[PDB]
Coordinates of C-alpha atoms in Angstrom, one line a residue:
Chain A
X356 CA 61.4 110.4 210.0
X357 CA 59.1 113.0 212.0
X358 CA 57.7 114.2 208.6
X359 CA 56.3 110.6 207.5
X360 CA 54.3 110.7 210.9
X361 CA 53.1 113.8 210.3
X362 CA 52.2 113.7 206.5
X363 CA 49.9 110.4 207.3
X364 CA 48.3 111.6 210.8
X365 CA 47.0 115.2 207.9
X366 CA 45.6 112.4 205.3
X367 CA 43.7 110.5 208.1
X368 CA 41.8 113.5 209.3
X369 CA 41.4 115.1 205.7
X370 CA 39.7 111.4 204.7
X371 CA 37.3 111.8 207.6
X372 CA 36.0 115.1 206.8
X373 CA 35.1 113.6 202.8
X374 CA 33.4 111.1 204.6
X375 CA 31.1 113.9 206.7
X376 CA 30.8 116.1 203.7
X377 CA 29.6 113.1 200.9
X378 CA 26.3 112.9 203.8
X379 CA 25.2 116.7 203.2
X380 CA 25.5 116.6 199.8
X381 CA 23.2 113.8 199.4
X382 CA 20.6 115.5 201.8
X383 CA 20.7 118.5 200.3
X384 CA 20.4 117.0 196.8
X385 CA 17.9 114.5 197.8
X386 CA 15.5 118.0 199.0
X387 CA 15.8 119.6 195.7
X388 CA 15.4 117.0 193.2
X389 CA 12.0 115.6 194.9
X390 CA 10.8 119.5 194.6
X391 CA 11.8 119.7 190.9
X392 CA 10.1 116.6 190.5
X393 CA 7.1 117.8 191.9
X394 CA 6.6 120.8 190.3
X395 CA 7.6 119.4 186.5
X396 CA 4.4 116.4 186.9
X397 CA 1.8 119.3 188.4
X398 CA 2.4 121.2 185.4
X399 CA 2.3 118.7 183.1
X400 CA -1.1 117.1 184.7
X401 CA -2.6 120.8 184.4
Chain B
X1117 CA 27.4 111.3 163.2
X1118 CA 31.4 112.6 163.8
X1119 CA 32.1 115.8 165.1
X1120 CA 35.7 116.8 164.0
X1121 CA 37.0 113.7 162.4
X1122 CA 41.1 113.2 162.8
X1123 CA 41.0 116.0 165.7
X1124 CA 41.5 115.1 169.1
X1125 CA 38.3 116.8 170.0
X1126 CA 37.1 113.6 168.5
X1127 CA 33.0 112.3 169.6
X1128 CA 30.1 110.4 167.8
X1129 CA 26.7 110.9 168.7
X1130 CA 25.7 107.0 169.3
X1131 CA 23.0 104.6 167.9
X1132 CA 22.1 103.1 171.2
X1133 CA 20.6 105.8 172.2
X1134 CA 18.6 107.0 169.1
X1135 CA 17.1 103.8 168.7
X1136 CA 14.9 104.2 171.8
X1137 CA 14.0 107.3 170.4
X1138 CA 12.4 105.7 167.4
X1139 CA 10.7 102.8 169.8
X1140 CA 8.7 105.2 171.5
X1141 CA 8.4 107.5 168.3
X1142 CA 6.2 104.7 166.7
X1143 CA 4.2 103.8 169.6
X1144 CA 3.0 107.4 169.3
X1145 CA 2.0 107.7 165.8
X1146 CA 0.0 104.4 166.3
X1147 CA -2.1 105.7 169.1
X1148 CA -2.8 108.8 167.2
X1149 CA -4.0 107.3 164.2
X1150 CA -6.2 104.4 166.2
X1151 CA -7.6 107.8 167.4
X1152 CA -8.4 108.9 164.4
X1153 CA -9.7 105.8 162.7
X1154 CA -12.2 105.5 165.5
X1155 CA -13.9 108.7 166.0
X1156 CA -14.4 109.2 162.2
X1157 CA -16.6 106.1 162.1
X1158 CA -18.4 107.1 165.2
X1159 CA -19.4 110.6 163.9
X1160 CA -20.4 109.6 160.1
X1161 CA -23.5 111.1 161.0
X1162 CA -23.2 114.1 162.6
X1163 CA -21.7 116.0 159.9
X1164 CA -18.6 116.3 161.3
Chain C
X448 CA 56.4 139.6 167.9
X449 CA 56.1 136.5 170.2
X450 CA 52.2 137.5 170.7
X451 CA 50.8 138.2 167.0
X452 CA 52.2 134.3 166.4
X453 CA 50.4 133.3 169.0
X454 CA 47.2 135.0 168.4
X455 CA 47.3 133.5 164.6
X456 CA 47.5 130.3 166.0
X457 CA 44.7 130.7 167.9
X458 CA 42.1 132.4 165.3
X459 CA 43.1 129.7 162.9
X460 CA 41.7 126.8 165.5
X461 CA 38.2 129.1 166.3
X462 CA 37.7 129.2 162.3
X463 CA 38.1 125.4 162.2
X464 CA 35.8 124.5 165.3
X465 CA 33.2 126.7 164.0
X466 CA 33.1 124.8 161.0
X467 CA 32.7 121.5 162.4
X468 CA 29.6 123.2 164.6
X469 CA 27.9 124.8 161.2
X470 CA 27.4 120.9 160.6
X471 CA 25.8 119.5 163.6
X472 CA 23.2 122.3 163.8
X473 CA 22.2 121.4 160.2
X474 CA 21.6 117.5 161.7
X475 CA 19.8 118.4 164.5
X476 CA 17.8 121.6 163.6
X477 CA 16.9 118.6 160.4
X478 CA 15.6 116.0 163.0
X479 CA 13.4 118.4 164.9
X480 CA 11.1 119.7 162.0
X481 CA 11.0 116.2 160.7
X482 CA 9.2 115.6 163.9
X483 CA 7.0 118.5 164.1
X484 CA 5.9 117.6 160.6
X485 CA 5.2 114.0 161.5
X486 CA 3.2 114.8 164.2
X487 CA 0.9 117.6 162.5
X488 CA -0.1 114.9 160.1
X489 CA -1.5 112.6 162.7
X490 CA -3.5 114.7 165.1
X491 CA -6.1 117.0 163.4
Chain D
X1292 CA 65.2 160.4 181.8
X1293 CA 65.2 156.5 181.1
X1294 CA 61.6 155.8 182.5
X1295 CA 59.8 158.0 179.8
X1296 CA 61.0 155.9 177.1
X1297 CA 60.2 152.7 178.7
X1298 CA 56.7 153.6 179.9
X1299 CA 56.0 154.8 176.3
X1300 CA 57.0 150.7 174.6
X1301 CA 54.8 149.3 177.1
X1302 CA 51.8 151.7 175.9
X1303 CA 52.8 150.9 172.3
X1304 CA 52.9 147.3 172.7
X1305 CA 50.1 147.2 174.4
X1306 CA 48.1 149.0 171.7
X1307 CA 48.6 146.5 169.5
X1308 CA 47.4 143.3 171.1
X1309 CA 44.1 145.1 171.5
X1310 CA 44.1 145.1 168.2
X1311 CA 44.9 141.7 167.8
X1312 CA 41.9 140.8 170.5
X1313 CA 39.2 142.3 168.7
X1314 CA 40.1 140.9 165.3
X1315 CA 39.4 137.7 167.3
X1316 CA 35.9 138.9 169.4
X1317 CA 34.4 139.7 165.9
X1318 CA 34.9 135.9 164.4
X1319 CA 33.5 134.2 167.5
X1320 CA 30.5 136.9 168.6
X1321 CA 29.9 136.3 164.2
X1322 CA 29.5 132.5 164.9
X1323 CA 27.4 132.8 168.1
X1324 CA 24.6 135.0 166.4
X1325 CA 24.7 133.1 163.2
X1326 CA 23.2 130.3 164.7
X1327 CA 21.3 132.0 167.1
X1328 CA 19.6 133.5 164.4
X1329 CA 19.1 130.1 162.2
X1330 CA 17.6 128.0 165.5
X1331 CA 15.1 130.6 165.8
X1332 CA 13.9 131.2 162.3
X1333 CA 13.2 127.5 162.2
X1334 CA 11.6 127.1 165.7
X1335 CA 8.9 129.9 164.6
X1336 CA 8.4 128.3 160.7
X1337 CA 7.4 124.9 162.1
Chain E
X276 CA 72.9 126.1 180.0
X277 CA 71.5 123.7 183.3
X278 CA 68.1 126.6 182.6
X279 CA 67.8 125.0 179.1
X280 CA 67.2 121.5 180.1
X281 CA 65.2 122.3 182.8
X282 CA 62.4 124.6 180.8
X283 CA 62.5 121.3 178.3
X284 CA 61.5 118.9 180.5
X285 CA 58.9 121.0 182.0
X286 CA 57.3 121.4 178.0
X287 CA 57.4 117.9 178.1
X288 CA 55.5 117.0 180.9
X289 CA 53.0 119.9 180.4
X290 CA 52.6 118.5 176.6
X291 CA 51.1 115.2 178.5
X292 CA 49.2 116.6 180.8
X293 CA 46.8 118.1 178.3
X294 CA 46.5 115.0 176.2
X295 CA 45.4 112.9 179.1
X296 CA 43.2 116.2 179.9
X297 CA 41.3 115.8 176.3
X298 CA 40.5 112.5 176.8
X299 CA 38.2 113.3 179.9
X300 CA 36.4 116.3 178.0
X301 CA 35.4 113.9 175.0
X302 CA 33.7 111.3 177.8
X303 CA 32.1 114.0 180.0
X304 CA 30.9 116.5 176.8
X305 CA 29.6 112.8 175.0
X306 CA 27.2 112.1 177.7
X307 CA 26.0 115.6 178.1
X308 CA 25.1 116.2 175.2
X309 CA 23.5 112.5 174.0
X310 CA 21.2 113.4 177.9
X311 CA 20.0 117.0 176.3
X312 CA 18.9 115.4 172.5
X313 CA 17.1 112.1 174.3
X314 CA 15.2 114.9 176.1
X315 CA 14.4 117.2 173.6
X316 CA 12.9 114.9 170.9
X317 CA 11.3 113.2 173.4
X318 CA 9.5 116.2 174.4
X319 CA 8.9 117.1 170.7
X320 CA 7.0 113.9 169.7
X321 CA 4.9 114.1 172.8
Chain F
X564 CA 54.2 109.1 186.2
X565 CA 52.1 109.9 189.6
X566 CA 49.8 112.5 187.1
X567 CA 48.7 109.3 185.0
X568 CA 47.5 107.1 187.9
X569 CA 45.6 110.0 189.1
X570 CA 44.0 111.1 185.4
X571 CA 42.7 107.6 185.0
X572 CA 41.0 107.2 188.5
X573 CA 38.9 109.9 187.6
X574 CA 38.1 108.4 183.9
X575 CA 36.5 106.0 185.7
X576 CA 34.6 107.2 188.0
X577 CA 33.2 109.7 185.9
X578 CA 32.1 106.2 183.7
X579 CA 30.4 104.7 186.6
X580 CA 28.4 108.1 186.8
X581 CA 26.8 108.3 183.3
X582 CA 25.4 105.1 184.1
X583 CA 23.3 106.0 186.9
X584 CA 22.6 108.9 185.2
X585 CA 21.5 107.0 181.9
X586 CA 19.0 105.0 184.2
X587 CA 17.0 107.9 186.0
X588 CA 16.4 109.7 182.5
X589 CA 14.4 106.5 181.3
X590 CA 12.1 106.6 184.5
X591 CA 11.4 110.2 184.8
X592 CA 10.9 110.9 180.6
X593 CA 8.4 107.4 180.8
X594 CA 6.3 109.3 183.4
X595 CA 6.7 112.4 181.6
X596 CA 4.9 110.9 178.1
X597 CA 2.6 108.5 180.6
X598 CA 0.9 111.8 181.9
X599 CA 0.9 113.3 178.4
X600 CA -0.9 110.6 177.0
X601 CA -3.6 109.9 179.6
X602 CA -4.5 114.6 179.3
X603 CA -5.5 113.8 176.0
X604 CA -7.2 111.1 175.9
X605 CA -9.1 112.9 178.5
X606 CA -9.9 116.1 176.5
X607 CA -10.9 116.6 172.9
Chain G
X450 CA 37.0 116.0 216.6
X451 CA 35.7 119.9 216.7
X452 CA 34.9 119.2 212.9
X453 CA 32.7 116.3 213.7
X454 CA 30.6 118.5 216.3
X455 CA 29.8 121.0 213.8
X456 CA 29.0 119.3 210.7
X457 CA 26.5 117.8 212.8
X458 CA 25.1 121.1 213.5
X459 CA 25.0 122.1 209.6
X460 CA 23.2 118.9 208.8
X461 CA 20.6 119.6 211.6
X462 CA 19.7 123.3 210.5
X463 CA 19.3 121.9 206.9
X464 CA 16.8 119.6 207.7
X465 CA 14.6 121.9 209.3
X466 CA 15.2 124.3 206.3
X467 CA 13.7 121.4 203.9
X468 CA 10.6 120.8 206.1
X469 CA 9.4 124.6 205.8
X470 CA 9.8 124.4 202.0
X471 CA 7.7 121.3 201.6
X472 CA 5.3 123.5 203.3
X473 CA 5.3 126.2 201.1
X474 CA 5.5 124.4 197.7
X475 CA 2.3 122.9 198.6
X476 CA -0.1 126.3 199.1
X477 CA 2.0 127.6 195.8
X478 CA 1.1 124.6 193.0
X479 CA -2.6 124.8 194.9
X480 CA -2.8 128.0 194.0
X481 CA -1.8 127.6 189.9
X482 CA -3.8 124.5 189.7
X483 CA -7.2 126.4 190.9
X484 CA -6.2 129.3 188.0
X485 CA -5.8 127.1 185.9
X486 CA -9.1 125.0 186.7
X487 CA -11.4 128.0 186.8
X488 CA -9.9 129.4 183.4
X489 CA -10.5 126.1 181.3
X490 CA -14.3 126.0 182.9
X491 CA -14.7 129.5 181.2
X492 CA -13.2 129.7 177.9
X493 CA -14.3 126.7 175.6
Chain H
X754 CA 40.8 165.4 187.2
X755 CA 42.4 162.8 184.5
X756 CA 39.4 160.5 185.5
X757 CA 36.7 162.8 184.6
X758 CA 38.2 162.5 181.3
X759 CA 38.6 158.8 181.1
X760 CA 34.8 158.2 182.5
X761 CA 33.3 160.7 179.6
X762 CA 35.3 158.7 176.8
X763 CA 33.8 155.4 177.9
X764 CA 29.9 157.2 178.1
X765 CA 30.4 158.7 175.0
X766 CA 31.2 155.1 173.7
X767 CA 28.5 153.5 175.3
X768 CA 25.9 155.6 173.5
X769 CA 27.3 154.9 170.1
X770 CA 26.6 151.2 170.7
X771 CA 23.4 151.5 171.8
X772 CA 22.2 153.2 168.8
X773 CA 23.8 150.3 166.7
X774 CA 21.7 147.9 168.9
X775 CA 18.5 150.0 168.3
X776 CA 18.8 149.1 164.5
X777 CA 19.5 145.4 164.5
X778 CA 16.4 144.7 167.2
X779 CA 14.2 146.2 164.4
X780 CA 15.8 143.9 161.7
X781 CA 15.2 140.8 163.6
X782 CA 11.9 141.7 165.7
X783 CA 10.6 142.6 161.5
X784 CA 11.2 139.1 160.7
X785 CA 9.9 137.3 163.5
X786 CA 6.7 139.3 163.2
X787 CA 6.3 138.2 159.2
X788 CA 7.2 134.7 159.9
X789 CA 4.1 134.3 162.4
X790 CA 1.9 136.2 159.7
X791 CA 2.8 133.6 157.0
X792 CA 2.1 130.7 159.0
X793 CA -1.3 131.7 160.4
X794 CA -2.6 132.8 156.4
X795 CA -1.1 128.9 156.1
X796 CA -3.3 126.7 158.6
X797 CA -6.4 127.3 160.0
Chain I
X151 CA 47.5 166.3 212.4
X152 CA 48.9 165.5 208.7
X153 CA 46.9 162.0 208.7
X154 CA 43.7 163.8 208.5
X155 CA 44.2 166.1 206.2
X156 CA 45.0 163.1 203.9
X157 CA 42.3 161.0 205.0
X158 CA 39.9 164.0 204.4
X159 CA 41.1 164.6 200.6
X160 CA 40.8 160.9 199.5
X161 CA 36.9 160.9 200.8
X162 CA 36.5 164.1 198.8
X163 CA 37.9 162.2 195.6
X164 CA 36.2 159.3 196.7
X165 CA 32.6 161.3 196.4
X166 CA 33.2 162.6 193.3
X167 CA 34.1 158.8 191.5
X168 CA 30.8 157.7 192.5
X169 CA 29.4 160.4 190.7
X170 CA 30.6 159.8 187.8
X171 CA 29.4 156.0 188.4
X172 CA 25.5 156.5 189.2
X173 CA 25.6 158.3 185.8
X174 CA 27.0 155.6 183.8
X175 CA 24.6 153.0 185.3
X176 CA 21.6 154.8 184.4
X177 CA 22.5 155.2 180.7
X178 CA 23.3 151.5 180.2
X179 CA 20.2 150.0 182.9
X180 CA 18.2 152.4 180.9
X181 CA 18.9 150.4 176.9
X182 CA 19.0 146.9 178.8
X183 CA 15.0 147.6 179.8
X184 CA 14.1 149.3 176.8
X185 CA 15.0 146.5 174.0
X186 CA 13.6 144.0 176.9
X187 CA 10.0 145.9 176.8
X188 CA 10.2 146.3 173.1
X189 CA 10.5 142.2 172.8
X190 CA 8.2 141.4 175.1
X191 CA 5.5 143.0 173.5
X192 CA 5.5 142.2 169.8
X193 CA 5.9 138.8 170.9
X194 CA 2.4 138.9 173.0
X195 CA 1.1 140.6 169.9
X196 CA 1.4 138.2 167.6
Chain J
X190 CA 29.0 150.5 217.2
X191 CA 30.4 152.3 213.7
X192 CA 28.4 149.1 212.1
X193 CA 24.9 149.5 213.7
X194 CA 24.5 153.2 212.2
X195 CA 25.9 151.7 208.7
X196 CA 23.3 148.4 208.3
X197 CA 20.4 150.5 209.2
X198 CA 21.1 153.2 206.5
X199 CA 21.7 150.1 204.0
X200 CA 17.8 148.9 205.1
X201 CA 16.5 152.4 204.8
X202 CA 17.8 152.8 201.0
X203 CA 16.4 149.1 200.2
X204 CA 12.9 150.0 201.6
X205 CA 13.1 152.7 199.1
X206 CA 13.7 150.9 196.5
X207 CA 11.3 148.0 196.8
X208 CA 8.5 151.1 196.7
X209 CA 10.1 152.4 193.4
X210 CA 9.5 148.5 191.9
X211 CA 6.0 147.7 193.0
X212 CA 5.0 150.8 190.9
X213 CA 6.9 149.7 187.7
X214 CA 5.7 146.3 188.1
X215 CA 1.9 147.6 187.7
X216 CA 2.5 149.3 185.1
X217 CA 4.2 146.7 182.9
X218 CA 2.0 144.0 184.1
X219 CA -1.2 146.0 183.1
X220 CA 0.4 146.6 179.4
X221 CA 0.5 142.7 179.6
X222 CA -2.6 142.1 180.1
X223 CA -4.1 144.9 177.8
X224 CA -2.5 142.9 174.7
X225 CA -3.6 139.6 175.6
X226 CA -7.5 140.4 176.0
X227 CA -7.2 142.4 172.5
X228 CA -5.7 139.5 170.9
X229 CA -8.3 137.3 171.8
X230 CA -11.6 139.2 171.3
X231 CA -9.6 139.6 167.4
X232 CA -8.9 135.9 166.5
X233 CA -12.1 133.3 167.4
Chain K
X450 CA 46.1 135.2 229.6
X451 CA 45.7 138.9 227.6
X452 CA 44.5 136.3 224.5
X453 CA 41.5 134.8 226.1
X454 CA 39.5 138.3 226.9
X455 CA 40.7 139.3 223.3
X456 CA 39.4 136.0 221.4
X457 CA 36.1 136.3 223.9
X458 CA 35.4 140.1 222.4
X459 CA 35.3 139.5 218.8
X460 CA 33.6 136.4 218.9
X461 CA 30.7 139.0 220.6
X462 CA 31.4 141.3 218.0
X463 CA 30.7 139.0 215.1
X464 CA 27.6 137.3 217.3
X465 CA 26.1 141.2 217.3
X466 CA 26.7 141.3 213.1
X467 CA 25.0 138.1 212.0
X468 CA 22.2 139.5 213.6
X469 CA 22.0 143.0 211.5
X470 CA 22.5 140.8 208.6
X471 CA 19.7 138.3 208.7
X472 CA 17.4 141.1 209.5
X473 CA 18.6 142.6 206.0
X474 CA 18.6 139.1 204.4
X475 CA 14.3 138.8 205.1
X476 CA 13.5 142.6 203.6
X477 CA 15.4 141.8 200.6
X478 CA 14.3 138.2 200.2
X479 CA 10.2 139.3 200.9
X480 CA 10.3 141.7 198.6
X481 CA 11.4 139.2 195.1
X482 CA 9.7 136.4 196.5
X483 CA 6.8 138.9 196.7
X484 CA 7.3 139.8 192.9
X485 CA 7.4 136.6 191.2
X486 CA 4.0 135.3 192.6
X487 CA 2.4 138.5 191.3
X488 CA 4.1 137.8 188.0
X489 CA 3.3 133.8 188.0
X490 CA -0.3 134.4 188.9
X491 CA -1.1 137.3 186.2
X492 CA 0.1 135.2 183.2
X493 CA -1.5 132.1 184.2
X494 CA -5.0 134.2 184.6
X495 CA -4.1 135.5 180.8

């Protein structure tokens, strides 16, 4: 079956790249939630 | 409190959740009365 | 008319769901004045 | 000539389920200011 | 009519798809919602 | 039914989620009141 | 991989992007914290 | 030109509304204003 | 060349749409800041 | 390069514009400011 | 190989592009940044 091949070699490399793209979100998301943070307990301080 | 009983777009605000609400809801009425209390004796004399 | 069915259907649903919201808001909007009141009372 | 007549139903019907849609705008954008309006009131009272 | 069958099943399975698709609203619009009231009476007391 | 499977797996995930979530509210509103509390006290 | 080459690269750039907005965050809340200072000292 | 003629029809609509909106910001802006009067007269 | 006589009348009908368009922007742009101002200030007022 | 000559005619009519707004913003934020000292030397 | 020089040009091409474009992207970007602080400021002073 040259298609089963195929079909499992596409899931393999599509599994990989959810794997590179779960790191950037977290830095990304990290950055702006410590800058929200930041700004909400200056304000509320004074 | 039910939002759209018998639909399928059934939900219910929960208790859980509310209660905390009315933990820390105390706590802050008893702090600003102990407040209160206090600085009346302390200024009995200077009319206020 | 396969459309003007379909468009009763639909108004008839909105008239419902709007009725369910004219509820909540009287629960909440209740809650947050009960607060505000509360509060007043207790600091000057 | 056949395509007049067509072209003139498809204007016709399509006349009427504008009229249809704005029966329905006029319930929801109702709705939407009516509580606007209440959350407001109240916010400014107390 | 092979057509006739065909367009029934498809109702079918359409019909389940959006019951299993309510189901997720209720749990996601629940939390959402129970966040946004915690917050705001919070911020109301004090 | 390969539609069902699927619908459930995200049910619960999406569970797991508003857990977390539940947590990080309680932290962040405490410090929220904590420096509310302490202004005050602090001026008239 | 040419995927795994340049998702590096994105996650590099990014980085440096975060460090030059810590910076200026920092000379922004000094500034609104020394209005709001020298207005309090003034007005009752 | 047959869209000279649709782009005057939907000018000559606009302005209608606007002059609709004109009235109701006076209706609610009225009521807003004489809300915040009451409650000043009320405390302090 | 027929090409450019074509190209040359489309540009020319082109023109005259956008026209048509700045007008239109400047009567709606024009309400949108007026009822903002108007708000602004009887709020700031009292 | 058909694109060079078509960015730097885009700049030129955003410089422009950016001129037009640092004028109404003076304007509007004097207005501001004229209401809020008015208020004040009115009500203690 | 005709395909290499091709693939080789536009690559320059789009190289030459970003560069107009992030010249464009700091005017723009000065410009509100510039306006909100002016804005932030003024209502903080009164």
């Amino acid at each position: 079956d040259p298609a089963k091949a195929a079909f499992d070699s596409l899931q393999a490399s599509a599994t990989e790249m959810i794997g590179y793209a779960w790191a950037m979100v977290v830095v990304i998301v990290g950055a702006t939630i410590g800058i929200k943070l930041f700004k909400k307990f200056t304000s509320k301080a004074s | 409190f039910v939002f759209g009983a018998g639909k399928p777009y059934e939900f219910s605000i929960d208790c859980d959740k509310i209660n905390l609400f009315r933990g820390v809801f105390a706590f802050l009425l008893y702090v600003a009365t102990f407040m209160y209390v206090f600085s009346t004796f302390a200024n009995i004399l200077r009319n206020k």
